[PDB]
């Protein structure tokens, strides 16, 4: 009975462990999706750049838009967090016991 009780409590705890792992994964995915959204849209402007007919004022304007999107990407990456953890702010390996 003691052995099974200990196993039960450990598995229960592993439950919430997996829960927080899933939570952080979903937060990461949402931030990733938004930055992807803000990245391909920028590549669009980059391709538009190639046209020869552009005046350098227009080229600098498109540069301004691209820079705005870069600033927004940095802002969103900094904002993205979970329980005081900034997933995109640093390289890392996180260990979540599930047994």
């Amino acid at each position: 009975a003691n052995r099974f009780t200990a196993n039960i409590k450990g598995l229960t705890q592993a439950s919430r462990n997996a829960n927080d792992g899933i939570s952080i994964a979903q937060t990461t995915e949402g931030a990733l999706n938004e930055i992807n959204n803000n990245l391909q849209r920028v590549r669009e402007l980059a391709v538009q750049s190639a046209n020869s007919t552009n005046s350098q004022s227009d080229l600098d304007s498109i540069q301004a838009e691209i820079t705005q999107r870069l600033n927004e990407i940095d802002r969103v990456s900094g904002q993205t967090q979970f329980n005081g953890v900034k997933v995109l702010a640093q390289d890392n390996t996180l260990t979540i016991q599930v047994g």
Partner: protein
Amino acid sequence: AAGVTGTASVVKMSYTDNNGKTIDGGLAVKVGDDYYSATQNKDGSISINT
């Protein structure tokens, strides 16, 4: 008296975690990589807590 060998100086403690958050504490005395919690004498001199 303790036989600590090295330069004696007064430093302020700063701690950082895995989140990246940082905090600062009081004062201490650092000799090499060692440290000792320090207390302020009312005159501006420093002492080691014991």
